[PDB]
């Protein structure tokens, strides 16, 4: 009985020793000669209004012009970022929404949250109205994040400490990913789309495989819940935002942490993390009413996106890298540039 | 300036804004009540007197109440509790008879300490509900309260404790300045529980109105 636990502990020690062996000059030693990105001043080009509650999620369409925002008001507004128009106002059934996702094709938006139901709304109906195409059920806990794969497969992360890949047409759990301990608070998909990483509240992140269906790698090094996660554009690294004010950028190939983006002036948690088009800049939705954008190669803070009157809950960067929407608990989106 | 399509799109945006404003006004006219509990404590009884989130819409005295029974959640409370930052009250059912059962009142008191002192609810009143009065009286007659509260000294008869459990629930409120933990023994009461809820919610609404107004 205890022999299995002893073998597991020995394997964990061996893995830690192997990682230590692969360790070398840190990212600071490599990118020490690189010049700093310089001060980044960023103006609120647009300020979308219309929500009557706290925004909990946002996502940029593939066209980088349309974004869908979910708020505890119960509404799923689809904005037109260029002109601050509202294309649609979906009346979500359950007002407790905590995620949203814009399908790559632009024909679907997903919403979920405390209802434990992932609803797949439709946008290109012949009747000119948004009709719930399918309401996925099966998660025994609050839904945290959902992301479309191409158009029919959608992966979800819920509070039952499991991630699942669905089949929208069938409405059944095609593959279930298990192995986490705490609530899986956030999810992110690799650009290659055959891999994705999830950050659970047990202070650990895992590298899942959509195809075969098991945790390829396990990453640790945090000290609190991982409230957000995002892939590096090259699809070989990801960054996690913990509750201890520490964005950490890991690597898939080396299976190690590279930096710990921390500052003593920050003592508040993290809500969202997203890179830039090249990944040189890494944003972060700190809950102390502002978002701090840091250089992802020297860990130096390089600008502050202040201007929100409450906690910055959701943050996202466009596909072309022309803007960074930040949705705060104040009922206001805000597109920066 | 704007082409025809752009003008019609702005028309659609104005219509969407009008619908959003109307629905927001309708929602604000309603009153939201989070309902916590220790589990089995009697939330069923009070919800009858009126997957995931189990809502309940009941109206009284031309006021639309919304009770969000959240006992079905099994995840960690710290992550989704901030969703209810805006509720005007927190009904908190507690099983009085459970003092000798298994020590469940210690768990209930721990939950009360977690909820009342939570950073998200520094200004939301707690409508404490003490029910199962008949069973509590029968048990108190059978056995004293020293099983769960050895520090208590008294005749160990009902109402001789002077709602001793109620006292221990009230003093658990650390921030007594910015909230009031209303208590009310929930017997059959001839449908007076809804009345107590109404007075408590009205008091909270008055406090909110005065706080907003200058």
């Amino acid at each position, epitope marked *: 009985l205890d022999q299995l636990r002893q073998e597991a502990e020995q394997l964990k020690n061996q893995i830690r020793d192997a990682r230590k062996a692969c360790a070398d000059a840190t990212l600071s030693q490599i990118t020490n000669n690189i010049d700093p990105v310089g001060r980044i001043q960023m103006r609120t080009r647009r300020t979308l209004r219309g929500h009557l509650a706290k925004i909990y999620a946002m996502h940029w369409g593939t066209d980088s*012009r*349309l974004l869908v925002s979910a708020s505890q008001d119960g509404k799923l507004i689809i904005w*037109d970022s260029y002109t601050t*128009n509202k*294309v*649609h106002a979906i009346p979500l059934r359950s007002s407790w929404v905590m995620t949203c996702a814009y399908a790559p094709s*632009g024909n679907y938006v997903a919403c979920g949250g405390l209802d434990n139901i992932c609803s797949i709304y439709n946008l*290109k109906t*012949r*009747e*000119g*109205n948004v009709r719930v195409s399918r309401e996925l059920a099966g998660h025994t806990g609050y839904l945290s994040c959902c992301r479309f794969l191409d158009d029919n497969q959608i992966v979800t992360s819920s509070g039952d400490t499991t991630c699942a890949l669905w089949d929208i047409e069938t409405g059944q759990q095609t593959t279930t990913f298990t192995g986490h301990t705490g609530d899986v608070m956030s999810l992110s998909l690799a650009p290659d789309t055959r891999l994705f990483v999830s950050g659970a509240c047990d202070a650990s992140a895992k590298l899942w495989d959509v195809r075969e269906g098991m945790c390829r790698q396990t990453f640790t090094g945090h000290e609190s819940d991982i409230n957000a996660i995002c892939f590096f554009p090259n699809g070989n690294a990801f960054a996690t935002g913990s509750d201890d004010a520490t964005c950490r950028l890991f690597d898939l190939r080396a299976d190690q942490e590279l930096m710990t983006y921390s500052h003593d002036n920050i003592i508040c948690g993290i809500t969202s993390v997203s890179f830039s088009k090249s990944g040189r800049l890494l944003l972060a939705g700190y809950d102390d009413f502002n978002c701090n954008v840091w250089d992802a190669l020297k860990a130096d803070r390089a600008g502050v996106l202040a201007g929100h009157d409450n906690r910055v809950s959701c943050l996202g960067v466009t596909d072309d890298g022309m803007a960074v929407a930040t949705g705060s608990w104040d009922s206001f989106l805000k597109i920066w540039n | 300036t704007l*082409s*025809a*399509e*752009d*003008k*019609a*799109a702005v*028309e*659609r945006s104005k*219509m969407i804004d009008r619908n959003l404003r109307e629905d927001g006004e309708k929602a604000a006219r309603e009153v939201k009540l989070l309902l916590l509990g220790a589990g089995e404590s009697g939330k069923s009884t009070i919800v009858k007197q009126m997957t995931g989130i189990v809502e309940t819409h009941f109206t009284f005295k031309d006021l639309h109440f919304k009770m969000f029974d959240v006992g079905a959640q099994r995840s960690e409370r710290k992550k989704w509790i901030h969703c209810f930052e805006g509720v005007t009250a927190i009904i908190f059912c507690v099983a009085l008879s459970d003092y000798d059962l298994v020590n469940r009142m210690h768990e209930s008191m721990k939950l009360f300490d977690s909820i009342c002192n939570n950073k998200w609810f520094t200004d939301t009143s707690i409508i404490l509900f003490l029910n199962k009065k008949d069973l509590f009286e029968e048990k108190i007659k059978k056995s004293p309260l020293t099983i769960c509260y050895p520090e208590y000294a008294g005749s160990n008869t009902y109402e001789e404790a002077a709602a001793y459990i109620q006292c221990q629930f009230e003093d658990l409120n650390k921030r007594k300045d910015t909230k009031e933990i209303y208590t009310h023994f929930t017997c059959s009461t001839d449908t007076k529980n809804v009345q107590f809820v109404f007075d408590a919610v009205t008091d909270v609404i008055i406090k909110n109105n005065l706080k907003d107004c200058g």
Partner: single-chain antibody
Amino acid sequence: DVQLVESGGGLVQPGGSRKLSCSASGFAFSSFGMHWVRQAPEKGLEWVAYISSGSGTIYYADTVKGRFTISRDDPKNTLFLQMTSLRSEDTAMYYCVRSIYYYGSSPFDFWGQGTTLTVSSSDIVMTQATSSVPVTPGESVSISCRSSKSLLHSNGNTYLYWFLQRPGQSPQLLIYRMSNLASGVPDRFSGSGSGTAFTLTISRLEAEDVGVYYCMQHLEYPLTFGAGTKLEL
């Protein structure tokens, strides 16, 4: 299914009045703008009137300004056009067209069956030089419709639409915004061009594509249709 049936036709004495009504059927009428397009017994189409979503702003053609009145009844899902003092030239068969306006939408998506009416006895001038052109099946054809004003707005959109009308059939949309194919249309059709110069391109023209092809501006709201190019043989 989405279907638009309009009624209120029949012979009317000149100078009289008549109400024409459209009957919506299951396409969320209240959030759909509606137009009224007329077809002369031998000539091309011509815009008549328009009522926005929610009975908001409303426009008319210069030829029928004041004379005609258009109204909608959302609870009844029915669209009314009230005409007064019908003239001899007013004889035409009137089509009932829906259109929804938002980013990426497809205005003029569906056309009603049409109501035949007979009467007893700015303004960007679009042009279709080619009146007709025969073509054998399986070949590629190109129809050019030159405008008289730059249709490329500052937003980058090119507000040109292409409509194909089968013989004795309600016209249907083919391409909107000069490049975006309609939903359900075959991929053979393709539009291109530039400001003040457009040319629809169809490759491997199969059967059931013969008919009058119309081009349409949407910049200046006194819309104008093309003369119409017919495909034969």
